[PDB]
Design a protein around this nucleic acid. Structure first.
Ligand SMILES: Nc1ncnc2c1ncn2[C@@H]1O[C@H](COP(=O)(O)O)[C@@H](O)[C@H]1O
Ligand SMILES: Nc1ncnc2c1ncn2[C@@H]1O[C@H](COP(=O)(O)O)[C@@H](O)[C@H]1O
Ligand SMILES: [Zn+2]
Ligand SMILES: [Zn+2]
Lengths: 200, 200
DNA sequence: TATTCCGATAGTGA
DNA sequence: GTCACTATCGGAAT
């Protein structure tokens, strides 16, 4: 099944150059179809937990959540900042980058092996090809890792979000269902953010 | 306006080689985007009648209707059969062709100058590019020239027809909204008809 | 709400 | 229910 395509990274991280970190517990791998300039996946290698649904993870596996957050803010932090600098610009400080990075689960994953998204906010990428892509990362469908449990969406209830009009995450401008126009606007927004950030 | 594009044929038939007949009253011209192997347009040159709606023509201009039918079945008959033989096969008799030709108006024309369609039944043509094309010629939207007045459709009421599933005019097989599949089938139907027609 | 291919659908400009 | 261009939307296979 295509839904098992990510399992090779937790079973054999030794075989993939795009696995930029691995140990006995987790694997950090570049997303093969990045939806932002930087887009990484942090996966548990635990044979049970990998097949637990992300909402269940958030709800009842707080130890794992804390452990993943600890990797991101600790031992993997330098690595992620370098990836970000390489994908965006060397001129961006850790401070600026930290405010331009989001971390979370999809409420309804396509791939069956639990994977935490770690990505920049730009959504400027050739692999961002349709409205559903964009909305899945910029709506409640993207469940940020620090979402309080009481504020989690219910499994299977977010279907309707994908039919809504497109809105820029940064400035709020709307684009109806004109994905191509959103795309061009996202590029401008990035150029703007970049210019303002280095110039700080 | 694009809707006046046919007026050049009745104003200056002398300037167009695809005007295969003209006199003071009418012009017979090849359709620039034929929706069947043979597709011709018979147009009145009368400055008033040209802008009368075809349903009004059918209803209240029986003299013009009779005159057009007289052209088709008389002075233009040999010409039309030669056009058909050239577009289909030299091996087809007038008798076979007469049963493979339809003559009528669109109930809701796009072009403003009254034009009677004269075309073969095949609907095998590169210019047949969408479902609306096919449906407009194979449903009550196509108002055959011998339709009794009491059986005419009402002006502006047939919009819903274009949303219906596709059905082969010859054998009845349905194709949902799969136009490409209908197209391939129409090709087969023609090959079948041709084979059966010349074979006797 | 995996990707990719293909085709149907929809708005536009002329 | 002009044509032609572009882009969105929709299923199917993988
Ligand atoms: N073979 C692959 N290698 C790496 N990442 C992939 C592969 N196939 C799909 N992906 C990514 O995996 C992610 C699936 O996330 P989700 O929608 O939460 O299941 C998407 O961001 C895809 O771009
Ligand atoms: N410039 C043109 N010359 C000849 N026929 C044309 C031209 N433009 C459009 N047509 C045809 O005119 C017909 C219009 O028919 P209707 O839909 O009844 O208005 C269609 O069959 C078109 O293919
Ligand atoms: Zn914006
Ligand atoms: Zn058939």
């Amino acid at each position: 099944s295509f839904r098992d395509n990510l399992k090779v990274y937790i079973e054999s991280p030794e075989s993939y150059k795009n696995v930029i970190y691995y140990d006995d517990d987790v694997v950090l791998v570049r997303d093969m179809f990045p939806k932002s300039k930087m887009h990484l996946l942090l996966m548990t290698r635990d044979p049970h937990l990998t097949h637990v649904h992300p909402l269940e993870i958030m709800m009842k596996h707080r130890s794992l959540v804390e452990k993943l957050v600890s990797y991101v803010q600790g031992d993997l932090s330098g690595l992620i900042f370098d990836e970000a600098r390489n994908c965006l610009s060397q001129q961006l400080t850790n401070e600026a980058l930290a405010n331009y990075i989001k971390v979370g689960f999809h409420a309804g994953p396509s791939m069956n092996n639990l994977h935490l998204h770690i990505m920049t906010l730009d959504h400027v990428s050739p692999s961002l090809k349709n409205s559903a892509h964009y909305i899945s990362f910029t709506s409640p469908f993207f469940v940020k890792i620090d979402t309080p449990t009481s504020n989690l969406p219910t499994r299977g209830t977010l279907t309707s979000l994908f039919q809504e009009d497109l809105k820029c995450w940064r400035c709020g401008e709307t684009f109806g269902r004109h994905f191509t126009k959103l795309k061009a606007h996202l590029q401008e927004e990035y150029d703007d953010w970049l210019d303002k950030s280095v110039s700080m």
